[PDB]
């Protein structure tokens, strides 16, 4: 009753729009989504209440683990004969006195085995229990749990110690793991009971194939089409029928009419049989203007665009009158139509509005059931008669050359052109294609989607199609694959094989491809919502990725409604998310004042204003005692205003410092430092840092310890976000305060026997960033955007642009003599040294490794075409990595290409 109203106010604060605004949406799909999605909410809540309190603690503090338990050979070599030295802390009695217990145990020990050994070492002091029964009431390993010292990360599940990311990181970085022994009931009491209630809104024919007609759509008239009548002569509505991004028939234009009276009243006839309309078929249209002329070819220009699903969410072929409010053209539309554009009516009703009428067949026309589709596919099945079409092959028509040809085709990258010969070939051998499952994306593109006979047969292949790798399945969720049977199969592969580690890794892409879904309620959204509601680490980022796009009206409805369903069932975390949302709001409003009102003032004056505004009661309270949106395991305690400052970077970002209120903060970090940036789109850096992380993981598995630094970056809104401060790091320019300056600095920071490890870490990190930046075509490097850690770890910051941002393949990271001197340990002939030869071998090995995983990187960029990133608008942008990775060329030709690009950039050496 009263509790619903309170919850509605909390959800409203979280999503940035009131819940009541969803209640007033008349669209039945919106109301059905809101109602129907609640079953995912029920399901998720039940799984959390299954084995309470542990199942609830597993939701709140899920194990931060690697996908595979298996440790690479060079990582195992860092261990002392397969054993790890672990420190276990116990907070005991008054004065909260900390007591450490250092243990030497097998890397694959279960946390309960780790707890047992710690209590044995604690008990060892009492030499009485030591001899007779060392157990001490079965060491009550079930009465305690291990927590990471300095952050809210627990070891609640039976995994091997080394599989937990904190431990693997400790091994790799040569750091001592510090864990805190905590009583189970101390954590369980912190965990509040989940009181999920259903909202008040929870309470509230002929077949397509029996229509022997071609498709017709009526264009009536347009309103709100205001244009300079002195400039423009006439206007017209351009239309087309599409399956995803590809047309199913030729485009049909209306008659040209003067803009003073846009009233066509024309029935446009399409070259498509109504039964041949695929499930995902859409009407794509646009209002264009035509003028000119100068005696030269006419001047066409799109004014506004709009896309419609030819079938509604209930499988009903759209009928009757319909009005579509159009969208404004985005810069760089290489056609008069925008089929990759969002399907639907513009929420702003004071925009061009085209009135349409569809056909009516004296009955509700519905898309056929799978029983009708199966029967038709089975029905669609002499020796020489198969020879009449290159698109069909009979019983035993699979040669050994053709089998190897299909294998060769499946290897090729997603951006590789499949010829029409290859499309007929793939389709004719579709039944053999089942034996090579990974070929599915190629075979699907070979289908004639404007043929019900082919599509029905393809549907039966997809039904009994063997599972493919999650990474291979993700391609099938991009814009190229609109069919629900194909997309449904892809979601089913992720449900079965995607680990929560990998889901967290690829969550940005999965959130993006939701935008390519025809309907609000689909298999993908249900999959992602259930995962977000059964894992709070996933849920946190699911919330922020959706919230960061709420300002974009192309996705605000879908994302708003999805966020509402999330908030209604996430539990206690809503209260915590709201603290973060308010904290961000105060930082946005404060930085907005500094960019608008106080921009033309000195740092002393600006800082005076910052300090005064921060010390305000409402501000102080809002901005302290919340969880870092960058990593919600990090508690941000009280602000250290003396350590906070306005940065000298443009867009004047705030450098913020909070106390870490963890009892063992000293063993991780006492102060949490974050850069709040207002002015830059953080999405490009977010995707680059994700790719860097993936590249590093590839190299590590292959046995190349090339340490990268994919620091934390999170977009929280329209050109607003957070950036992780890398501790003990400085830019090359701030080091230079000659060529030996950098090497001399690292020598002083790493004196004695540690020197050789610092040079090694420098060379290795340098090699990783050299390869990564060249492949990705990152923005040009310089002394202010290259940083070095005290230990010697080199890394880059502020990516900004990737791929061909110039608009012939650049080398962003040119190694000056400064870097080569450090590499060669202070040598005269920097080129001809064993240290440089070692360094080159690292770059070559790293280059080829990424070449082998090319399909993943192409696919991660492809799924990202949905977001409005300026340098990632078409598949031609993505094609830059086809060039840098030299995919058309051979492996030896690729090394020669890489060597030549490095040779030309550095003026010799390679």
Ligand X SMILES: CC(C)n1nc(-c2ccc3oc(N)nc3c2)c2c(N)nc(N)nc21
User: Which residues contribute to the site for ligand X (CB under 6 A)?
Assistant: 675, 677, 685, 711, 723, 725-726, 729, 731, 797-798
Q: Measured between alpha carbons, how far is residue 107 from residues 80, 177, 179 in Å?
A: 10, 12, 15
With tokens 């913020």, the residue in question is 656
HSE (side-chain half, CA atoms, 13 Å) at 162: 20
- Which two tokens mark 777? 């075509």
CA distances from 702 to 75, 849, 886 (A): 11, 8, 21
In sequence order, the β-bridge partners of residue 723 are 675, 713
- Least distance to ligand X, CB of residue 681, Å: 10
| Residue closer to ligand X, measured from CB, 522 or 731 | 731
Q: Which residues is the chain interrupted after (C–N above 2.5 Å)?
A: 204, 381, 737, 807
Query: Which element (helix H / strand E) includes 88?
Result: strand 83-91
Q: Could you identify the residue written with the tokens 């003032």?
A: 601
CB of 649 to ligand X, least distance (A): 6
As measured in angstroms, the least distance from the Cβ of 812 to ligand X is 15
Q: How far apart are CA 648 and CA 646, in angstroms?
A: 7
DSSP assignment of 823-884 equals: HTTS-SSSSSSHHHHHHHHHHHHHHHHHHHTHHHHHHHHHGGGGS--TT-SSHHHHTHHHHH
Per-residue b/e over 778-790, b at no fewer than 16 CB within 10 Å? Answer: bbebeeebbbbbe
Shortest separation between residue 315's beta carbon and ligand X, angstroms = 45
Answer for the pair 216, 359: CB distance below 8 angstroms, yes or no: yes
For residue 783, the minimal CB distance to ligand X (Å) is 11
CA 481 to chain centre: 18
Q: Which is nearer to ligand X, 481 or 813 (CB)?
A: 813
CB of 625 to ligand X, least distance (A): 24
Phi, psi of 693 (to 5 degrees): -55, -45
Q: Which of residues 662 and 685 has its CB atom nearest to ligand X in the complex?
A: 685
d(CA 329, CA 303): 7
Which CB atom, from 729 or from 862, has the smaller least distance to ligand X?
A: 729
Q: Give the 3-state secondary structure of 755-774.
A: HHHHHHHHHHHHHHHHHHHH
Closest CA to 588 of 673, 635, 653: 653
For residue 597, CA distances in Å to 590, 717, 798, 905 come to 10, 21, 27, 45
Sheet with 720-724: strands ordered across: 645-646, 654-659, 671-678, 720-724, 713-717
Residue (498 or 709) nearer to ligand X, CB = 709
Q: Rounded distance, CA 495 to CA 466, Å? A: 14
CB atoms within 10 A of CB 890: 9
Residue 413 or 798: the one with the smaller Cβ distance to ligand X is: 798
Spatial CA neighbour of 799 closest among 650, 667, 670, 681:
681
Q: Could you give the C-alpha distances from 545 to 129, 320, 476, 528, in angstroms and in order?
A: 54, 38, 21, 12
**Alpha carbons 661 and 638: distance in angstroms, whole number:** 8
Cis peptide before 641 (omega within 30 of 0): no
Ramachandran category for residue 241: left, alpha or beta (phi over 0 → left; psi -120 to 50 → alpha): beta
Could you list the beta-strand ranges (E) of 619-728.
626-627, 635-636, 645-646, 654-659, 671-678, 713-717, 720-724
- To the nearest whole angstrom, how small is the minimum distance from the Cβ of residue 657 to ligand X? 12
Closer residue to ligand X, CB minimum distance, 619 or 802: 802
**CB of residue 748 to ligand X, shortest distance in Å:** 19
Whole-number minimum distance, CB 762 to ligand X, in Å?
Answer: 17
Instruction: Specify the residue, 564 or 680, whose C-beta has the smaller distance to ligand X.
Output: 680
Distance in Å, CB of 675 to ligand X, minimum: 5
Place of tokens 């999503």: 15
| Length of the chain counted residue by residue | 910
Q: How far is 770 from 781, CA to CA, in rounded Å?
A: 10
Q: Among 531, 471, 549, 465, which residue's Cα sits nearest to residue 506?
A: 471
- Going by their DSSP bridges, the two strands 178-183 and 83-91 should be labelled as parallel
Please calculate the CA angle 731-734-737 and round it to the nearest 5 degrees. 155
Residue with tokens 């554009």: 341
CB-nearer residue toward ligand X: 194 or 798: 798
- Which residues have CB under 8 Å from 241's CB, separation 6+? 215, 247, 248, 249, 270, 272, 277, 281, 282, 283, 284, 310
Q: To the nearest whole angstrom, how small is the minimum distance from the Cβ of residue 673 to ligand X? A: 8
């Amino acid at each position: 009753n009263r509790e619903e109203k309170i919850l509605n106010r909390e959800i409203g604060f979280a999503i940035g729009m009131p819940v009541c605004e969803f209640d007033m949406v008349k669209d039945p799909e919106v109301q059905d989504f809101r109602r129907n999605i609640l079953n995912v909410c029920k399901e998720a809540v039940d799984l959390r209440d299954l084995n309470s309190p542990h199942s609830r603690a597993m939701y709140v503090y899920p194990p931060n683990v690697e996908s595979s338990p298996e440790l690479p050979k060079h990582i195992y070599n860092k261990l002392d004969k397969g054993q790890i030295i672990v420190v276990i802390w116990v907070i005991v009695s008054p004065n909260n006195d900390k007591q450490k217990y250092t243990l030497k145990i097998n890397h694959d020990c279960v946390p309960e085995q780790v707890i047992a050994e710690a209590i044995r070492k604690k008990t060892r002091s009492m030499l009485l229990s030591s001899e007779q029964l060392k157990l001490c009431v079965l060491e009550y390993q079930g009465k305690y749990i291990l927590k990471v010292c300095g952050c809210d990360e627990y070891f609640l599940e039976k995994y091997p110690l080394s599989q937990y990311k904190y431990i693997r990181s400790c091994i790799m970085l040569g750091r001592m793991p510090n864990l805190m022994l905590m009583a189970k009931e101390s954590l369980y009491s912190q965990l509040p009971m989940d009181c999920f209630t259903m909202p008040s809104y929870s309470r509230r024919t002929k077949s397509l194939w029996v229509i022997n007609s071609a498709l017709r759509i009526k264009i009536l008239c347009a309103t709100y089409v205001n244009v300079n009548i002195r400039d423009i002569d006439k206007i017209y509505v351009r239309t087309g029928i599409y399956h995803g991004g590809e047309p199913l028939c030729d485009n049909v234009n209306t008659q040209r009419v003067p803009c003073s009276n846009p009233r066509w009243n024309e029935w446009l006839n399409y070259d498509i049989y109504i039964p041949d309309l695929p499930r995902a078929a859409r009407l794509c249209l646009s209002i264009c203007s035509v003028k000119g002329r100068k005696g030269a070819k006419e001047e066409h220009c799109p004014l506004a665009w709009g896309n419609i699903n030819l079938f509604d969410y209930t499988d009903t072929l759209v009928s009757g009158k319909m009005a579509l409010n159009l969208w404004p053209v985005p810069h760089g539309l290489e056609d008069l139509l925008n089929p990759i554009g969002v399907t639907g009516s513009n929420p702003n009703k004071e925009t061009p509005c085209l009135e349409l009428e569809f056909d009516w067949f004296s009955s509700v026309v519905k898309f056929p059931d799978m029983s009708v589709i199966e029967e038709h596919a089975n029905w669609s099945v002499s020796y020489s008669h198969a020879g009449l079409s290159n698109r069909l092959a009979r019983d035993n028509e699979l040669r050994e050359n053709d089998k190897e040809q299909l294998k060769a085709i499946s290897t090729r990258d997603p951006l590789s052109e499949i010829t029409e010969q290859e499309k007929d070939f793939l389709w004719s051998h579709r039944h053999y294609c089942v034996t090579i499952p990974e070929i599915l994306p190629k075979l699907l593109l070979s289908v004639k989607w404007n043929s019900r006979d082919e599509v029905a047969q393809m549907y039966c292949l997809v039904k009994d199609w063997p599972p493919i790798k999650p990474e291979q399945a993700m391609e099938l969720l991009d814009c190229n694959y609109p069919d629900p049977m194909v997309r449904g199969f892809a979601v089913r592969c992720l449900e079965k094989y995607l680990t929560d580690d990998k889901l967290s890794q690829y969550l940005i892409q999965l959130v993006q491809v939701l935008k390519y879904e025809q309907y609000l309620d689909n298999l993908l959204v249900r999959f992602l919502l259930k995962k977000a509601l059964t894992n709070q680490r996933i849920g946190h980022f699911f919330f922020w990725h959706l919230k960061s796009e709420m300002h974009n009206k192309t996705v605000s409805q879908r994302f708003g409604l999805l966020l509402e369903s999330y908030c209604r069932a996430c539990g206690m975390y809503l209260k915590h998310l709201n603290r973060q949302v308010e904290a961000m709001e105060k930082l946005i409003n404060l930085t907005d004042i500094l960019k608008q009102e106080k921009k033309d003032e000195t740092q002393k004056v600006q800082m005076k204003f910052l300090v005064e505004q921060m010390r305000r009661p409402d501000f102080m309270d809002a901005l302290q005692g919340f969880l870092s949106p960058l990593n919600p395991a990090h508690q941000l305690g009280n602000l250290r205003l003396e350590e906070c400052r306005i940065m000298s970077s443009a867009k004047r970002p705030l450098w913020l410092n909070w106390e870490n209120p963890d009892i063992m903060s000293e063993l991780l970090f006492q102060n949490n430092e974050i850069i709040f940036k207002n002015g830059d789109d953080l999405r490009q850096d977010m995707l680059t840092l994700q790719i860097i992380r993936i590249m590093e993981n590839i190299w590590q598995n292959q046995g190349l310890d090339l340490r990268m630094l994919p620091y934390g970056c999170l977009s929280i809104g329209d050109c607003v976000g957070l950036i992780e401060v890398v501790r003990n790091s400085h830019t090359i320019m701030q080091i230079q305060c000659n060529s030996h300056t950098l090497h001399q600095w690292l020598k002083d920071k790493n004196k004695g026997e540690i020197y050789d490890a610092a040079i090694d870490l420098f060379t290795r990190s340098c090699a990783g960033y050299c390869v990564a930046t060249f492949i990705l075509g990152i923005g040009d490097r310089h002394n202010s955007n290259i940083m070095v850690k005290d230990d010697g770890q080199l890394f880059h910051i502020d990516f900004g642009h990737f791929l061909d941002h110039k608009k012939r393949e650049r080398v962003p990271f040119v190694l000056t003599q400064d870097f080569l001197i450090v590499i060669s340990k202070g040598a005269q002939e920097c080129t001809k040294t064993r240290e440089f030869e070692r360094f080159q071998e690292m770059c070559y090995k790293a280059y080829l490794a990424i070449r082998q995983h090319a399909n993943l990187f192409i696919n991660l960029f492809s799924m990202m075409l949905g977001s409005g990133m300026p340098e990632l608008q078409s598949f031609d942008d993505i094609a830059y990595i086809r060039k840098t990775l030299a995919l058309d060329k051979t492996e030896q030709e690729a090394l020669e290409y890489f060597m030549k690009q490095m040779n030309d950039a550095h003026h010799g050496g390679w």
